[PDB]
Design a protein around this ligand. Sequence first.
Ligand SMILES: Nc1ncnc2c1ncn2[C@@H]1O[C@H](COP(=O)(O)OP(=O)(O)O)[C@@H](O)[C@H]1O
Ligand SMILES: Nc1ncnc2c1ncn2[C@@H]1O[C@H](COP(=O)(O)OP(=O)(O)O)[C@@H](O)[C@H]1O
Ligand SMILES: Nc1ncnc2c1ncn2[C@@H]1O[C@H](COP(=O)(O)OP(=O)(O)O)[C@@H](O)[C@H]1O
Ligand SMILES: [Mg+2]
Ligand SMILES: [Mg+2]
Ligand SMILES: [Mg+2]
Lengths: 536, 139, 52, 525, 260, 76
Amino acid sequence: EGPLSVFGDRSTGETIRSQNVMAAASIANIVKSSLGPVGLDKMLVDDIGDVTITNDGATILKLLEVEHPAAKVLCELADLQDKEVGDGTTSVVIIAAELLKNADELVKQKIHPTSVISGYRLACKEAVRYINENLIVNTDELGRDCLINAAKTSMSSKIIGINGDFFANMVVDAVLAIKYTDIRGQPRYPVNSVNILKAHGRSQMESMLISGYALNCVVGSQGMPKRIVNAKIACLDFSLQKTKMKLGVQVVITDPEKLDQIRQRESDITKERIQKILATGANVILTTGGIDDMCLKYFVEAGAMAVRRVLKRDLKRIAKASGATILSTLANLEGEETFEAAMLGQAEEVVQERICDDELILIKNTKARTSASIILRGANDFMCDEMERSLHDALCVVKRVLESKSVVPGGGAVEAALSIYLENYATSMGSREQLAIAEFARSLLVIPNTLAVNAAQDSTDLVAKLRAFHNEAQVNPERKNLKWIGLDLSNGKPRDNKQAGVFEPTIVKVKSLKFATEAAITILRIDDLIKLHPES
Amino acid sequence: LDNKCSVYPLTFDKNENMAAKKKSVAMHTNYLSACSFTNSDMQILTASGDGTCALWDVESGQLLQSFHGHGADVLCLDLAPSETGNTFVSGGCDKKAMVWDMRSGQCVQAFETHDINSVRYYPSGDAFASGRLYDLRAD
Amino acid sequence: TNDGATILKQMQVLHPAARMLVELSKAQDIEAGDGTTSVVIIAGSLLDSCTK
Amino acid sequence: MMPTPVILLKEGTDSSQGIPQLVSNISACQVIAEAVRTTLGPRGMDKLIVDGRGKATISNDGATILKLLDVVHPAAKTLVDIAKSQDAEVGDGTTSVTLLAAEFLKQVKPYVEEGLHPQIIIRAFRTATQLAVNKIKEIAVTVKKADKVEQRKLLEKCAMTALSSKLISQQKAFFAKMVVDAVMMLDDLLQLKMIGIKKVQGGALEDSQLVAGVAFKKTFSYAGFEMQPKKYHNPKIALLNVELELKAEKDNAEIRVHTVEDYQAIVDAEWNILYDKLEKIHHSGAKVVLSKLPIGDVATQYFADRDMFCAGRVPEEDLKRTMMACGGSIQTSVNALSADVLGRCQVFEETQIGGERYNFFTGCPKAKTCTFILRGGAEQFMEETERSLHDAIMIVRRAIKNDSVVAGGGAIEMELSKYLRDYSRTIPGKQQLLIGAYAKALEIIPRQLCDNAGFDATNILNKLRARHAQGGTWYGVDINNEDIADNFEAFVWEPAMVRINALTAASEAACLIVSVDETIKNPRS
Amino acid sequence: VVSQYSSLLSPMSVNAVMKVIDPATATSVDLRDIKIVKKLGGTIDDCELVEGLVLTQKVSNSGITRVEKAKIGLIQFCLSAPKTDMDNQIVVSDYAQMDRVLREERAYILNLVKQIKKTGCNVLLIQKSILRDALSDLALHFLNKMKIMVIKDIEREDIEFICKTIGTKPVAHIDQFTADMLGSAELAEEVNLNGSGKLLKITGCASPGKTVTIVVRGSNKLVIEEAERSIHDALCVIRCLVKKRALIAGGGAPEIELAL
Amino acid sequence: ASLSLAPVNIFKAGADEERAETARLTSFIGAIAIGDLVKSTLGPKGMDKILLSSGRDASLMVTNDGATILKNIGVD
Ligand SMILES: Nc1ncnc2c1ncn2[C@@H]1O[C@H](COP(=O)(O)OP(=O)(O)O)[C@@H](O)[C@H]1O
Ligand SMILES: Nc1ncnc2c1ncn2[C@@H]1O[C@H](COP(=O)(O)OP(=O)(O)O)[C@@H](O)[C@H]1O
Ligand SMILES: Nc1ncnc2c1ncn2[C@@H]1O[C@H](COP(=O)(O)OP(=O)(O)O)[C@@H](O)[C@H]1O
Ligand SMILES: [Mg+2]
Ligand SMILES: [Mg+2]
Ligand SMILES: [Mg+2]
């Protein structure tokens, strides 16, 4: 097939540059319809009838079967944004594809990709610098209402959108509950320590915020009590079973009289351990291992709750919250086998609650630390699954706002402001990079354009009106209040989004621009593709 | 279609009961013709398509000795009677069965009267199945 | 990648002359670490002259 | 999609509607355009297309390339159709139409993607096209002197500009002079069939000649033909539609005789009929005899014995050209061969032309026709030469109809783009964006010229825009000098109607493509 | 591809090469003294030059993730129940022998941990062990109760690099485990890469001997691999300068001069 | 470079060519085979051949004539 003699295909020049832009645009067009409050969810049938109704950008691309290497770049780009930010996942894919599409237009005009890459890198640096200097709002000037508005804004476009007035309150309260401080006095919020339980049944309004912890587990035996008032929680990392000697130990009997006593110790060793644990007043015993039937009877007779096969991460949170200590073994530093009262957690109640023909443990009002859990109620599993994903974004958004105390106006306010500034700033940087920076400014308008399109409104007029307001703010020093003007999708007109309470964490826009630019730069650097045929 | 086995016990999901140390050297790749574990679990004998028997140490993970001299690829190999310096046979596609000794790294004995694929030592060790029977004491 | 050695290694060239060019690129990578593309281009140009 | 027990349309019917299908149509038009992009301008290249039969074709002509492509996309076929339309009406600019249409569609693609109503785009295109056509009519340079030398120079320059993109561009002055001379001999209708084009393999391009008369290949001479003289210094030509052979009087004629004397009389009567026809032809005074119908061996030997020339099975077009060159009349009967129905030329001659024998009728003073004899090293060489000469001939004909010219090399497009941008700056703003997009799309021609020539298109475009805005109407791409120049003084001249039709057809095609919202394909039968 | 980041990588590469050689005597550079760690996430602007040791292993302890004034100890034996090289079994014939076995095993593990702690060690690195449990759960419990960070599953090939970096002498038998074989360091903490994984960084050592680490980060895996290749090219070029102290112009000047 | 040993293929399917050494080898082999076949039927003490036709007729022919021997053989 020529003089190269390679067992594979090859595409060079504009053939592969346009194909790469195709693949990037194909991924964006998948998720472009699920952006903004007037966005719509999607069904994802998994070839065996499994249904996944979602609006999250990362979740859509995770389940999609992508084959083009350039498309996989954007699909992994969405995943990275989810891990490091948690929101803006759909936006970053849209921006990156738009950035690549407009960059390829310049390359077709005999502009070298290095010039385009250099221009994109400069624009990304100035966009971040401009945002940090003119478009940030200090949350200390807004109080608690900022957190609710930030949470409410994220919940728009989600299945918990209209009911966000009630849902935002749990997210703010749940995050504030798990707040703790570390060395050098930095208040850190370990979001995802808020256990989220899904159970269909009652309406969404009956979603409960547990002032404690919720275990997706039940008591081992029906004979145990299902409610303890003053719980003394003992957390163990080992099974309570009949004692069996290790591999290096063998039992060889020469005198038959010793056989019966040996078998007795196989069960008395565990009994002695349980008696030591119960002797200190423990009421709740949580273990990550199994519990044999003969061991459960000891808790039954003592009137104590015992739960087996508790998840390790669940036990760690309960131990941290209740003040208990995880014990992988009963062994002190004196070589003995003892259990102390100081290693007991406490709680104000432990209940075997019943939730829609199913049961779970509620550790209510733990002491020495405040924890939180959320139980989501919906029509069915498909809808309950989506609320968990939607709530995860809200938990992440509030986490960023509490860590970094700056927010930016939403609804395309940032992109509109950046497009005006960057295109004006492009005229003062070089001669060949001017086009590249200008195209960076133009590409940012895809976000407000998509919001207006999804609402079936005139995107051309709204963006032009929105850009006109932002142009006035930059050129008129006394009209600086127009920076906050965004889009009101309900009525289709510009609106001061700072007053309207449409906020986003600053890190969402900043990290989106950095990640999208690098992803666009990576694809733009390619001009030749060699696709070796599979060996099989 | 052709595989239908990609989900094989590779996961080895257990409760960490001391058996998770499977090592799984697989450094040489190619084809693992015989991954027989030595009676003394210190060493692993492996045969590849190149026709060289390879001896590895589980602890260090280093290739002790590569046994070469077989005419074709070694399809099968066995172990010593109990340990006996692991004087192991090696049957391959070259119709020849020969014995190797790491104390010298040489083909101590050879037999050609038959590809051998079912070598198995006699419990005494004076002979071995050659699926025939070759006598060590009489060659 | 833009590295000459990586490009030549990844693409499975079948002609023996291309294989020896890949080996030459590996050797240049070993001894110097840069100029991996330049050495291959130089060898190709030299053989092109050898044609005439 | 719940499966209805009885589906509405036939199974396998494919329907795509909405914005995505329109975007796909624009992409298809882009794909069609990029297949002819490199064949634009003096630095353009040729395309080679091999059909299923393995018979390759080589062409620089956009319409030919598009026709040879088996385009099946419904939206893409519109570009092929407008290329054919431009070829039919004008004959040159079959690449410009496709490039302009695809550039219009590409320019308005972003606005379509964001939900703009296509009727607005259509209205904007129509407004811009009307304004551009009016501007072309207004600024086109026409010379109201009616000077023969000036008109001839204008025609030659237009032909040279039309020809300076083909493989005959090196001898473009020679070929343009030949084309102008050929066209100016046509009387009033400028019919293409009155310009013969013969392709004779072998020989250099400069060996091509234009005969002030008619020439055609020798047509299956019978026995005794080589005994006829092959040169006459004032022959009279008997143009005939007559079969000079021994044959049945009629297909349904039956002769019934019952005497050997009558048998001999019948045989002699057939011979006497043939000899009477031949004797009337000979006594007409003619020396060269040409027939649309076969001429038998008996007649060939008869004419050889009289030092006459005969040729049968002459193609009808060649006979009509001989009529127009010599001035006779094709006679189906020889009973009245008066001197007026006999052709006349100064010199008739049969000569060797590159391994073939041709009959030459030269020295016709009242000639209203001509014949091109094209020499080349291959069949496709002569075919592409014929296509290029056809382009030049069509341009010269249109210029004869009206002598209005605009400087080429992107000058007219740049001026129109500047005018349209200046207009669009003075309208509300919804139409302003679309008219500005139209003006920007007009810049495709000089950009493609620079790309084909290998320049930096952006800098040349910036210089052109600055020159046009500052002042200067006919500044365009200068290929040889790597720069821009006043293309009017460089004699890069094209008739105004070429650009007028190009803009009109491109606008109509773009509007038609945009106006479509749904494509439905029925299953094949 | 890393050309806009060259302002960050060029000084980084020069520092990396200079930190692993002696400029007055070095005649070649062993690039294996420079360790490159690829972690997904972030941007190439986040590439960092660590003057100490970076380990991708996870800390076994929970709750101990930052030790100041660390005393790192490297262990090549196993902290589990005693097990000889020869075949060994414990034969039980009486009921008392059962809990005697349990108690004696506990005492053995406790004595090992006490001997380790008596030297002042507070960060413990355990070499990966097969055929014997390197770190028993009871041993981990005892170590955690004594406030010692434990990192296990250390690769055999990395022992030389670790010892050269933090100045720790490996210990293969508990009898030879003493304070003088510990590697003092300023700080040993496990950092989190903003939800893209965790890294154990031991920065600041009493004997920082000719070894440096480079952490490469990027948005996606392809650009990370290309950045690693580019940084390797830069290191190789500085190595070339070290080998042959001669500089020539670029941009085709040598080729044009050579042709002429 | 040669037509056959070129990275691009210039031939229809089933059409081949033989360069200097190969063409000379084939020509010499064919000529030597013809000479060896026809000889041994030469001179007073020569022998005859049998031309057993493989066609439908299966004609049998015994001859010492070289021309008839060379005529009725399938030569490629
Ligand atoms: N109430 C609102 N009014 C106007 N715009 C909004 C409102 N709420 C959200 N938006 C905008 O709609 C967009 C929706 O983003 P979304 O798709 O939920 O994020 P992700 O990209 O993580 O999926 C955000 O960029 C935000 O600026
Ligand atoms: N900024 C520059 N200006 C001019 N020439 C350069 C520049 N940078 C690199 N070069 C040249 O490009 C050539 C190729 O270098 P490079 O692609 O980095 O590695 P390799 O030589 O392995 O291809 C070198 O010979 C160098 O002289
Ligand atoms: N000498 C020249 N200098 C600059 N431009 C030219 C020259 N000759 C022709 N052109 C331009 O090339 C373009 C294409 O002409 P051509 O390829 O011959 O036919 P078509 O218009 O069918 O492509 C015309 O628009 C004309 O302006
Ligand atoms: Mg969102
Ligand atoms: Mg280099
Ligand atoms: Mg033309």
